[PDB]
Amino acid sequence: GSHKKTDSEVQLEMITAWKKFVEEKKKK
Amino acid sequence: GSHKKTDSEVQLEMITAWKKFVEEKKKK
Amino acid sequence: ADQLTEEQIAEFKEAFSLFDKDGDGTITTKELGTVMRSLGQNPTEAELQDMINEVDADGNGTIDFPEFLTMMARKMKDTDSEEEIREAFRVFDKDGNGYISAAELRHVMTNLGEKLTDEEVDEMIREADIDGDGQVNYEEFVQMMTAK
Ligand SMILES: [Ca+2]
Ligand SMILES: [Ca+2]
Ligand SMILES: [Ca+2]
Ligand SMILES: [Ca+2]
Numbered sequence: 001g002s003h004k005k006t007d008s009e010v011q012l013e014m015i016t017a018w019k020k021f022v023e024e025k026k027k028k
Numbered sequence: 029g030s031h032k033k034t035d036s037e038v039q040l041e042m043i044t045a046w047k048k049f050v051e052e053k054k055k056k
Numbered sequence: 057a058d059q060l061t062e063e064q065i066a067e068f069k070e071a072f073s074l075f076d077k078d079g080d081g082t083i084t085t086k087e088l089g090t091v092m093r094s095l096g097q098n099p100t101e102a103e104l105q106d107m108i109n110e111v112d113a114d115g116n117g118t119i120d121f122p123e124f125l126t127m128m129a130r131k132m133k134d135t136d137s138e139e140e141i142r143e144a145f146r147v148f149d150k151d152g153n154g155y156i157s158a159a160e161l162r163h164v165m166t167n168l169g170e171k172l173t174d175e176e177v178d179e180m181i182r183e184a185d186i187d188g189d190g191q192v193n194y195e196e197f198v199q200m201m202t203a204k
Contacts (some may be wrong), residue, residue: 002054005183005184007184007203007204008074008203010183010184010200010203011201011202011203012091013049013053014046014049014201015088015107016049017042017045017046017048017049018042018045018107019099019103019104019107020045020048020049021041021042021044021045021107022103022106022107023100023103024045025041026103026106034132035131035132035134035137035140035141035143035144036143036144036147038110038111038132039144039148040164040165040168043161043165044165044170046180047165047172047176047177047180049180050176050179050180051176054179
């Protein structure tokens with residue numbers, strides 16, 4: 001039930017995505 | 029040909045993981 | 057566009073300062089860690105190094121004001137990398153008109169092997185779409201990654 005996106009959260013989730021791409025490849 | 033990966037490849041890695049945050053966060 | 061104004065400078069200044077609560081002016085792996093920790097997640101330090109170091113010109117880990125604004129705007133371990141972004145746009149596109157369409161994003165992604173719906177892309181366009189025409193130009197691309 002999101003009313004409005006907060007600018008800080010968009011950056012933080014986009015930084016979480018950076019962590020995700022590395023994690024997925026290097027999973028050994 | 030190719031050996032080391034340029035910006036384009038890193039950007040494909042990010043954009044996939046970026047779509048992944050939308051799934052994780054906002055898919056009921 | 058035939059005149060610049062300090063609005064851009066002030067915007068970028070604040071967007072950096074948000075993450076750099078310390079004051080010293082570096083976004084290190086500890087800085088990244090503490091932010092996630094406060095909220096309620098505990099990262100793996102190896103990954104925190106990598107995710108920065110792909111882009112970082114120095115490859116030092118301590119990302120100062122200019123090195124952060126590089127990572128935001130310029131991007132990649134090259135010098136004047138606004139051109140490298142303009143080139144990245146042309147790879148993704150099948151035209152290159154200072155934009156990136158939703159269809160073009162679906163194509164270049166799915167080409168690898170990923171049958172996923174377009175609406176998931178569109179959510180993270182209209183999270184911060186300035187122009188409002190179902191594309192992503194230079195300014196919109198940076199500003200969406202640098203949301204303040
Ligand atoms: Ca610091
Ligand atoms: Ca630096
Ligand atoms: Ca386009
Ligand atoms: Ca647009």
